[PDB]
Amino acid sequence: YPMNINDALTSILASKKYRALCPDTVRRILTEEWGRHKSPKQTVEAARTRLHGICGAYVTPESLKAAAAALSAGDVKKALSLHASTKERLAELDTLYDFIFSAETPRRVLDIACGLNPLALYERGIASVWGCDIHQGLGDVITPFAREKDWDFTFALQDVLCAPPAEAGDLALIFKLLPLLEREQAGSAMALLQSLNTPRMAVSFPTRNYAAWFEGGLPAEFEIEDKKTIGTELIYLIKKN
Numbered sequence: 001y002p003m004n005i006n007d008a009l010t011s012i013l014a015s016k017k018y019r020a021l022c023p024d025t026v027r028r029i030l031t032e033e034w035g036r037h038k039s040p041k042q043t044v045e046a047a048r049t050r051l052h053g054i055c056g057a058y059v060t061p062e063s064l065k066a067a068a069a070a071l072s073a074g075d076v077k078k079a080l081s082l083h084a085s086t087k088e089r090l091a092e093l094d095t096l097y098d099f100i101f102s103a104e105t106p107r108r109v110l111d112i113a114c115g116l117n118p119l120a121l122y123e124r125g126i127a128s129v130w131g132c133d134i135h136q137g138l139g140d141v142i143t144p145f146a147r148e149k150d151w152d153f154t155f156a157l158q159d160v161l162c163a164p165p166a167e168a169g170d171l172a173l174i175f176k177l178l179p180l181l182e183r184e185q186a187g188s189a190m191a192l193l194q195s196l197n198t199p200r201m202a203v204s205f206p207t208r209n210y211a212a213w214f215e216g217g218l219p220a221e222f223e224i225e226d227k228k229t230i231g232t233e234l235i236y237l238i239k240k241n
């Protein structure tokens with residue numbers, strides 16, 4: 001059994017469950033867990049438990065295959081319905097993007113922890129999208145479709161707790177991400193916002209204390225321009241000064 005981080009990393013990445021995960025994520029979690037000074041066996045188990053939570057319930061290999069099939073048939077809505085977070089968004093999708101884009105439709109969007117949401121941006125006619133996430137299966141769904149459509153979408157397999165997004169754009173989307181980052185590393189959510197090379201951002205939280213947390217913690221160089229509940233998301237439009 002794995003008795004060090006390197007061997008544990010190899011083991012986890014070889015598993016059917018975790019093979020599509022960003023290797024940096026696996027190493028980050030293993031290294032943090034190793035620092036708790038438990039046995040190698042307990043440490044690897046603790047790491048797997050965390051990775052299970054990080055992978056979550058958003059997609060499966062079969063749902064990803066079905067999303068690809070949907071895209072091949074031109075059924076973008078069906079593909080969107082096959083990631084749990086976009087499925088939640090479906091009913092009010094155009095209301096949401098109408099709200100975000102009311103003043104201006106951006107040329108280039110950075111979609112941070114993108115899930116399958118870039119497919120919605122395609123349908124909104126966004127010219128250029130860069131999305132990052134830690135599950136390569138997401139890129140494996142979106143990228144072949146983007147190439148078929150001559151659409152300027154790029155996917156990065158990137159853990160934002162390992163390295164900040166380096167790209168630049170007109171608008172960053174940070175949907176349903178800040179809470180999970182904060183739970184995992186205190187202070188990381190606002191640090192992510194401070195790192196983004198966009199003049200404006202749209203940040204969302206699940207909703208029917210996130211509002212209080214966000215409004216109380218948003219660094220002074222940002223201004224909240226609007227705030228609205230649309231479907232089961234609370235959305236803030238912010239500008240960086």
Ligand SMILES: Nc1ncnc2c1ncn2[C@@H]1O[C@H](CSCC[C@H](N)C(=O)O)[C@@H](O)[C@H]1O
Nearest residue numbers: 085086113114115117133134159160175176
């Ligand atoms: N450290 C990390 N770096 C990058 N992405 C991460 C991450 N931890 C979790 N994620 C990703 O965060 C996403 C949360 S679900 C939200 C997906 C998308 N933003 C949407 O709203 O539709 C998942 O796709 C998950 O894989």
